[PDB]
Design an enzyme around this catalytic site. Structure first.
Site, PDB file in Angstrom:
ATOM      1  N   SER A   1       5.750  20.335  -4.631  1.00 31.31           N
ATOM      2  CA  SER A   1       4.692  21.260  -4.201  1.00 31.31           C
ATOM      3  C   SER A   1       3.658  20.572  -3.306  1.00 31.31           C
ATOM      4  O   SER A   1       3.133  21.176  -2.367  1.00 31.31           O
ATOM      5  CB  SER A   1       3.997  21.896  -5.415  1.00 31.31           C
ATOM      6  OG  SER A   1       3.341  20.916  -6.208  1.00 31.31           O
TER       7      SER A   1
ATOM      8  N   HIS B   1       0.943  12.814  -9.332  1.00 28.01           N
ATOM      9  CA  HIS B   1       0.204  13.995  -8.877  1.00 28.01           C
ATOM     10  C   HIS B   1       1.119  15.198  -8.678  1.00 28.01           C
ATOM     11  O   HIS B   1       0.710  16.330  -8.926  1.00 28.01           O
ATOM     12  CB  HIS B   1      -0.578  13.686  -7.603  1.00 28.01           C
ATOM     13  CG  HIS B   1      -1.822  12.892  -7.848  1.00 28.01           C
ATOM     14  ND1 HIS B   1      -3.076  13.333  -7.477  1.00 28.01           N
ATOM     15  CD2 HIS B   1      -2.009  11.685  -8.433  1.00 28.01           C
ATOM     16  CE1 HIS B   1      -3.978  12.433  -7.827  1.00 28.01           C
ATOM     17  NE2 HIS B   1      -3.355  11.420  -8.408  1.00 28.01           N
TER      18      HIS B   1
ATOM     19  N   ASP C   1       8.164  19.263  -8.395  1.00 30.26           N
ATOM     20  CA  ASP C   1       8.831  20.292  -7.594  1.00 30.26           C
ATOM     21  C   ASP C   1       8.608  20.117  -6.093  1.00 30.26           C
ATOM     22  O   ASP C   1       9.077  20.935  -5.288  1.00 30.26           O
ATOM     23  CB  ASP C   1       8.359  21.680  -8.034  1.00 30.26           C
ATOM     24  CG  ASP C   1       6.850  21.851  -7.914  1.00 30.26           C
ATOM     25  OD1 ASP C   1       6.140  20.871  -7.589  1.00 30.26           O
ATOM     26  OD2 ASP C   1       6.358  22.970  -8.158  1.00 30.26           O
TER      27      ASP C   1
ATOM     28  N   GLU D   1       0.812  -1.209   0.000  1.00 29.42           N
ATOM     29  CA  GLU D   1       0.000   0.000   0.000  1.00 29.42           C
ATOM     30  C   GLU D   1       0.850   1.265   0.000  1.00 29.42           C
ATOM     31  O   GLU D   1       0.621   2.162  -0.809  1.00 29.42           O
ATOM     32  CB  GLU D   1      -0.975   0.020   1.187  1.00 29.42           C
ATOM     33  CG  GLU D   1      -1.827   1.308   1.274  1.00 29.42           C
ATOM     34  CD  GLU D   1      -2.797   1.462   0.115  1.00 29.42           C
ATOM     35  OE1 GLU D   1      -3.140   0.442  -0.519  1.00 29.42           O
ATOM     36  OE2 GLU D   1      -3.233   2.605  -0.164  1.00 29.42           O
TER      37      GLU D   1
ATOM     38  N   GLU E   1       1.010   4.183  -3.091  1.00 26.54           N
ATOM     39  CA  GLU E   1       0.550   5.568  -2.904  1.00 26.54           C
ATOM     40  C   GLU E   1       1.673   6.552  -3.197  1.00 26.54           C
ATOM     41  O   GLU E   1       1.443   7.634  -3.736  1.00 26.54           O
ATOM     42  CB  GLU E   1       0.002   5.781  -1.490  1.00 26.54           C
ATOM     43  CG  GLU E   1      -1.321   5.064  -1.204  1.00 26.54           C
ATOM     44  CD  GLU E   1      -2.540   5.736  -1.848  1.00 26.54           C
ATOM     45  OE1 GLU E   1      -2.381   6.759  -2.560  1.00 26.54           O
ATOM     46  OE2 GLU E   1      -3.670   5.244  -1.631  1.00 26.54           O
TER      47      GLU E   1
ATOM     48  N   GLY F   1       5.510  21.594 -11.901  1.00 26.22           N
ATOM     49  CA  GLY F   1       5.725  20.179 -12.180  1.00 26.22           C
ATOM     50  C   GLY F   1       6.318  19.392 -11.026  1.00 26.22           C
ATOM     51  O   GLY F   1       5.850  19.492  -9.895  1.00 26.22           O
TER      52      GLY F   1
ATOM     53  N   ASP G   1      -9.047   3.491  -3.278  1.00 25.37           N
ATOM     54  CA  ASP G   1      -9.618   3.618  -1.936  1.00 25.37           C
ATOM     55  C   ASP G   1     -10.769   4.632  -1.871  1.00 25.37           C
ATOM     56  O   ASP G   1     -11.584   4.598  -0.946  1.00 25.37           O
ATOM     57  CB  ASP G   1      -8.535   4.050  -0.952  1.00 25.37           C
ATOM     58  CG  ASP G   1      -7.331   3.140  -0.976  1.00 25.37           C
ATOM     59  OD1 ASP G   1      -7.520   1.914  -1.059  1.00 25.37           O
ATOM     60  OD2 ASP G   1      -6.199   3.659  -0.917  1.00 25.37           O
TER      61      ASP G   1
ATOM     62  N   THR H   1       2.506  -7.206  -8.244  1.00 27.49           N
ATOM     63  CA  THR H   1       3.414  -7.656  -9.294  1.00 27.49           C
ATOM     64  C   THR H   1       3.396  -6.698 -10.491  1.00 27.49           C
ATOM     65  O   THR H   1       2.336  -6.418 -11.060  1.00 27.49           O
ATOM     66  CB  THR H   1       3.042  -9.073  -9.767  1.00 27.49           C
ATOM     67  OG1 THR H   1       2.866  -9.923  -8.630  1.00 27.49           O
ATOM     68  CG2 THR H   1       4.119  -9.649 -10.670  1.00 27.49           C
TER      69      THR H   1
HETATM   70  C1  HEM Z   1      -5.389   9.329 -17.178  1.00 26.60           C
HETATM   71  C2  HEM Z   1      -4.478   9.271 -16.187  1.00 26.60           C
HETATM   72  C3  HEM Z   1      -4.763   8.638 -14.805  1.00 26.60           C
HETATM   73  C4  HEM Z   1      -5.937   8.467 -14.165  1.00 26.60           C
HETATM   74  C5  HEM Z   1      -7.351   8.907 -14.620  1.00 26.60           C
HETATM   75  C6  HEM Z   1      -5.663   7.801 -12.903  1.00 26.60           C
HETATM   76  C7  HEM Z   1      -6.603   7.456 -11.953  1.00 26.60           C
HETATM   77  C8  HEM Z   1      -6.395   6.788 -10.768  1.00 26.60           C
HETATM   78  C9  HEM Z   1      -7.397   6.534  -9.749  1.00 26.60           C
HETATM   79  C10 HEM Z   1      -8.881   6.965  -9.815  1.00 26.60           C
HETATM   80  C11 HEM Z   1      -6.811   5.854  -8.757  1.00 26.60           C
HETATM   81  C12 HEM Z   1      -7.501   5.373  -7.460  1.00 26.60           C
HETATM   82  C13 HEM Z   1      -7.249   6.377  -6.337  1.00 26.60           C
HETATM   83  C14 HEM Z   1      -8.056   5.962  -5.137  1.00 26.60           C
HETATM   84  O1  HEM Z   1      -9.304   5.997  -5.226  1.00 26.60           O
HETATM   85  O2  HEM Z   1      -7.459   5.588  -4.088  1.00 26.60           O
HETATM   86  C15 HEM Z   1      -5.414   5.661  -9.106  1.00 26.60           C
HETATM   87  C16 HEM Z   1      -4.453   5.010  -8.363  1.00 26.60           C
HETATM   88  C17 HEM Z   1      -3.111   4.882  -8.677  1.00 26.60           C
HETATM   89  N1  HEM Z   1      -2.428   5.554  -9.697  1.00 26.60           N
HETATM   90 FE1  HEM Z   1      -3.383   6.312 -11.450  1.00 26.60          FE
HETATM   91  N2  HEM Z   1      -4.307   7.568 -12.826  1.00 26.60           N
HETATM   92  C18 HEM Z   1      -3.718   8.057 -13.970  1.00 26.60           C
HETATM   93  C19 HEM Z   1      -2.372   8.011 -14.256  1.00 26.60           C
HETATM   94  C20 HEM Z   1      -1.386   7.490 -13.434  1.00 26.60           C
HETATM   95  C21 HEM Z   1       0.043   7.600 -13.640  1.00 26.60           C
HETATM   96  C22 HEM Z   1       0.688   8.347 -14.833  1.00 26.60           C
HETATM   97  C23 HEM Z   1       0.653   6.967 -12.619  1.00 26.60           C
HETATM   98  C24 HEM Z   1       2.160   6.758 -12.344  1.00 26.60           C
HETATM   99  C25 HEM Z   1       3.117   6.898 -13.269  1.00 26.60           C
HETATM  100  C26 HEM Z   1      -0.367   6.423 -11.746  1.00 26.60           C
HETATM  101  C27 HEM Z   1      -0.131   5.686 -10.598  1.00 26.60           C
HETATM  102  C28 HEM Z   1      -1.078   5.200  -9.723  1.00 26.60           C
HETATM  103  C29 HEM Z   1      -0.822   4.241  -8.669  1.00 26.60           C
HETATM  104  C30 HEM Z   1       0.518   3.557  -8.322  1.00 26.60           C
HETATM  105  C31 HEM Z   1      -2.161   4.040  -7.965  1.00 26.60           C
HETATM  106  C32 HEM Z   1      -2.443   3.092  -6.781  1.00 26.60           C
HETATM  107  C33 HEM Z   1      -2.369   3.766  -5.410  1.00 26.60           C
HETATM  108  C34 HEM Z   1      -2.659   2.667  -4.420  1.00 26.60           C
HETATM  109  O3  HEM Z   1      -2.857   1.496  -4.869  1.00 26.60           O
HETATM  110  O4  HEM Z   1      -2.679   2.939  -3.192  1.00 26.60           O
HETATM  111  N3  HEM Z   1      -1.593   6.760 -12.276  1.00 26.60           N
HETATM  112  N4  HEM Z   1      -5.195   6.239 -10.342  1.00 26.60           N
HETATM  113 CA    CA Z   2      -0.129  -6.532 -11.719  1.00 30.85          CA
HETATM  114 CA    CA Z   3       4.170  19.679  -8.240  1.00 32.50          CA
HETATM  115 MN    MN Z   4      -6.175   6.639   2.426  1.00 33.12          MN
HETATM  116 MN    MN Z   5      -4.337   3.293  -1.939  1.00 32.02          MN
END
Ligand code: HEM
Ligand code: CA
Ligand code: CA
Ligand code: MN
Ligand code: MN
Length: 367
Positions: free
Chosen positions: A68, A48, A66, A37, A41, A64, A181, A198
Site C-alpha cells: 500500500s 511501515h 500489501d 542507508e 530504509e 497489512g 534522520d 553490523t
Molecule cells: C515500537 C516500535 C518501533 C518504533 C517506535 C520505531 C521507531 C523508529 C524511529 C523513530 C526511527 C527513526 C526514523 C527517522 O527519524 O529517520 C526508526 C528507524 C528504523 N526502524 Fe524502527 N521503530 C519500531 C519498530 C521497528 C521494526 C519492527 C522494524 C523492522 C522489523 C524497524 C526497523 C527500522 C530500521 C531498519 C530503521 C533505520 C532506518 C535508517 O537507518 O535509515 N523498526 N524506527
Molecule cells: Ca549494530
Molecule cells: Ca500496507
Molecule cells: Mn530522508
Molecule cells: Mn535513514
C-alpha cells in the site's frame, strides 16, 4: 513442480525464478551489496507497510503487507508517523514496472529480505510470495511512534497480528542497524547503536547504559538521553553521535519486556533467529500463508556474523548499566580500550564520504 533458475538456484516453484533478476536489480541499482542507508530504509519500510492492519477494526483499516505504501504513495508515506519513509518508497516504485509479474507487496518484503542479507549477522529470512497486486491505502494511526509507552506499543502489535512481547522485542533487534534522520531536525543519520552496519546485539547492551547527554537538541519528541552523544557534527563532520529512542528505553526497562531485552545481549544466534521468526510473521500480515508459495531459496545467503564478541564501547563499562531483569545475570564482557568516545562512522567502510542511491518519486517528506 521444481525447476532451476538462471543463477543456478533450485526452486520448489518456477514462479520463484522471477525474483532472481529482481534481487539482482535491487542490488545493482539501489542497495549495492551494502548494509547502508538505502538498505536500512528499505527494512524500515517492510515494517511501515506490514503493521498497518487491525484485527479490531477489520480489513477496511488496512491490508497489512500489501504494498500500500508503494501503490498509494500520496497517502500513507505522508502521514506524520511515516515522515521520511518516502526515500525507500521512491526507491522501490520503479521496480514495479521493471518487474511487472511481481506485486508491490511481494516487492516490499523481498527487498527487505535482500537488504537484510547485506548485513553481517542478519538471518536468512523466510520469503513467501503471492501477495495480491491490488489493495487500498490504510488509515492513519496504525504505526507506533517513539514517544508511545509500552502498553500502547504492545497493544498495537497484538492488534496488528497477535505479536507477543517477546516477538516485539525480537523485532526491535532491527534497531541494531538503524539510524534517525527525522527525530532531531538538526541531525542526519543519528545511529541507535555503535555498529549501525553490523547486525549484532550492541543495541541491546547500549540502551541499558545510563544516558549522559544528547547528540543534538535535548527536547525532541520520542528521544531520551544517550550514553554516547559525542559526534563530529559541530565542526562539519558527518559522524553523528548516538541517539536513544524513548520507546527502546521503555522496552528495556518494562517488566513485560526487560528480560527479553537483556536476554539478547551477547547472544548473537538467539537474537538473529528470534528476529527471523518474528519478522517472517510480520512479512505475511494481511495474508493466509496457505494462499502463498514458499520462495525462501531465492533469498541471498547473508554475510556471516562478524568475529568480534559483544563488548562495552570505549569509555563505558558495567558500572554504567541500568539493569531491570532479575531472571538472568548480565554477562561479563570486555571493555573496548580508550579514554575518549569513539566516533561512530557514517559509512560501512569507516569513512564519512559515502553517498546513497535516491530515485526521485511521488512520495514526499517534511522537515
Ligand atoms: C515500537 C516500535 C518501533 C518504533 C517506535 C520505531 C521507531 C523508529 C524511529 C523513530 C526511527 C527513526 C526514523 C527517522 O527519524 O529517520 C526508526 C528507524 C528504523 N526502524 Fe524502527 N521503530 C519500531 C519498530 C521497528 C521494526 C519492527 C522494524 C523492522 C522489523 C524497524 C526497523 C527500522 C530500521 C531498519 C530503521 C533505520 C532506518 C535508517 O537507518 O535509515 N523498526 N524506527
Ligand atoms: Ca549494530
Ligand atoms: Ca500496507
Ligand atoms: Mn530522508
Ligand atoms: Mn535513514
Amino acid at each position: 513442480p521444481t525447476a532451476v533458475c538462471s543463477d543456478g538456484t533450485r526452486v520448489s516453484n518456477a514462479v520463484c525464478c522471477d525474483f532472481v533478476s529482481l534481487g539482482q536489480d535491487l542490488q545493482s541499482m539501489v542497495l549495492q551489496g551494502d548494509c547502508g542507508e538505502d538498505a536500512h530504509e528499505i527494512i524500515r519500510l517492510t515494517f511501515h507497510d506490514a503493521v498497518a492492519i487491525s484485527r479490531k477494526l477489520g480489513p477496511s483499516a488496512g491490508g497489512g503487507a500489501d504494498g500500500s505504501m508503494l501503490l498509494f504513495p500520496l497517502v500513507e508515506p505522508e502521514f506524520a508517523a511515516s515522515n521520511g519513509i518516502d526515500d525507500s518508497v521512491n526507491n522501490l516504485i520503479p521496480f514495479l514496472s521493471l518487474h511487472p509479474t511481481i506485486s508491490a507487496g511481494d516487492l516490499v518484503q523481498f527487498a527487505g529480505a535482500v537488504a537484510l542479507s547485506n548485513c553481517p549477522g542478519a538471518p536468512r529470512v523466510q520469503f513467501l510470495a503471492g501477495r495480491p497486486n491490488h489493495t487500498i491505502a490504510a488509515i492513519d494511526g496504525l504505526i507506533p511512534e517513539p514517544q508511545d509507552n509500552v502498553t500502547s506499543i504492545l497493544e498495537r502489535f497484538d492488534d496488528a497480528g497477535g505479536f507477543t512481547p517477546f516477538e516485539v522485542v525480537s523485532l526491535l533487534a532491527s534497531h541494531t542497524i538503524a539510524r534517525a534522520d527525522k527525530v532531531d531536525p538538526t541531525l542526519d543519520a543519528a545511529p541507535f547503536d555503535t555498529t549501525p552496519f553490523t547486525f549484532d546485539s550492541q543495541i541491546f547492551l547500549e540502551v541499558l547504559l545510563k544516558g549522559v547527554g544528547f547528540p543534538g537538541l535535548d527536547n525532541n519528541t520520542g528521544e531520551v538521553s544517550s550514553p554516547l552523544p559525542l559526534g563530529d557534527t559541530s565542526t562539519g563532520g558527518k559522524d553523528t553521535g548516538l541517539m536513544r529512542l524513548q520507546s527502546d528505553f521503555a522496552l528495556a526497562h518494562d517488566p513485560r519486556t526487560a528480560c527479553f531485552w537483556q536476554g539478547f545481549v551477547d547472544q548473537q544466534e538467539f537474537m538473529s533467529q528470534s528476529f527471523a521468526s518474528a519478522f517472517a510473521k510480520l512479512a505475511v500480515l494481511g495474508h493466509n500463508t496457505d494462499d502463498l508459495i514458499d520462495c525462501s531459496e531465492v533469498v541471498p545467503v547473508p554475510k556471516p556474523a562478524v568475529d568480534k564478541p559483544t563488548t562495552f564501547p570505549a569509555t563505558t563499562g558495567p558500572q554504567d548499566l541500568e539493569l531491570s531483569c532479575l531472571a538472568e545475570r548480565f554477562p561479563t564482557l570486555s571493555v573496548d580500550p580508550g579514554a575518549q568516545e569513539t566516533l561512530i562512522p557514517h559509512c560501512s567502510d569507516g569513512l564519512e564520504n559515502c553517498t546513497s542511491v535516491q530515485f526521485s518519486g511521488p512520495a514526499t517528506d517534511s522537515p
